[PDB]
Design a binder for this molecule. Structure first.
Ligand SMILES: COc1cc2c(-c3cc4c(Cl)ccnc4[nH]3)cn(CCN3CCN(C)CC3)c2cc1OC
Length: 273
């Protein structure tokens, strides 16, 4: 142990998720990402099956398995003042936020493939009892070679439950109106709301709401040409009342989600890889 298993490379990014470095595991030259999180900033703590660890570690372990769609936790270390998490690192990779910044609004065929993969990944998290609570383009990585998307940054998540949530530390512009008005939400329809924001972001090039009162009003204006089926799915996910929002099954059965590209054909056509 003790930092002799990994060569540290450039800093990839830093923020609310801590500091993430590009890395290489020296045992087999495996590309990894090294994330440092200070203990002082960790708000939620969990406990592993038979030790006091951050909730992010608990959630990552519950979702780290053969399914690609979530960036997997390979290992973790505890330091006196911080936790260090070893995560897989696709190569090459670009976060969805910067991908949208460079390309603008995405073609609906590309947005369909991306959105479908996000749904499959979120469904996987829920099946494992994990609620992400911060679904957004900044927390999605693109494997440019394979055309596969990856969820990251579970540092705001929680265990999935069927009762109401009264806390939230995700991105406010992605939060549902029931959180803005009442500080109450249930996990999955809040998730569907954020998926609606995400889908609008992909097909329009930016998020639909910037202020609390626009979220509360829930009125969706499209600044780009978007098909009627895509507009309908977005407005469905952005329904004001949580119970009017579609389930994951209803999203993936929607007419706009039919005949999705596979990941590798997505990369060949739209990522030219
Ligand atoms: C590889 O290039 C980048 C990677 C990241 C990451 C990041 C990568 C990563 C991996 Cl590989 C595993 C686990 N977490 C990660 N975060 C996180 N970020 C920054 C994400 N957000 C970009 C927009 N900024 C306003 C807020 C932060 C990355 C930025 C990168 O290029 C600008």
């Amino acid at each position: 142990p003790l930092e002799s298993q990994y060569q540290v490379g450039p800093l990839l990014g830093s923020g609310g998720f801590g500091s993430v470095y590009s890395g290489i595991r020296v045992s087999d030259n495996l590309p990894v990402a090294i994330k440092h999180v200070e203990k002082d900033r960790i708000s939620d703590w969990g406990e592993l099956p038979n030790t006091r660890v951050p909730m992010e570690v608990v959630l990552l372990k519950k979702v780290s398995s053969g399914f690609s769609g979530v960036i997997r936790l390979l290992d973790w270390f505890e330091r006196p003042d911080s936790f260090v998490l070893i995560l897989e690192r696709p190569e090459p990779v670009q976060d969805l936020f910067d991908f949208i910044t460079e390309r603008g609004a995405l073609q609906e065929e590309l947005a369909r493939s991306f959105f479908w993969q996000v749904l499959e990944a979120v469904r996987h998290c829920h099946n494992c009892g994990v609620l992400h609570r911060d679904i957004k383009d900044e927390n999605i990585l693109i494997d440019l070679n394979r055309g596969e998307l990856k969820l990251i940054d579970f540092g705001s998540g929680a265990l999935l439950k069927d009762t109401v949530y009264t806390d939230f530390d995700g991105t406010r512009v992605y939060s549902p109106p029931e959180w803005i008005r009442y500080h109450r939400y249930h996990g999955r329809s809040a998730a569907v709301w954020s998926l609606g924001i995400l889908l609008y972001d992909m097909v329009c090039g930016d998020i639909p709401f910037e202020h609390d009162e626009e979220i509360i009003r829930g009125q969706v204006f499209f600044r780009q040409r978007v098909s009627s089926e895509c507009q309908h799915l977005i407005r469905w996910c952005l329904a004001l009342r949580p119970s009017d929002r579609p389930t994951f099954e209803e999203i993936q059965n929607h007419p706009w989600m039919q005949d999705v590209l596979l990941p590798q054909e997505t990369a060949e056509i739209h990522l030219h890889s």
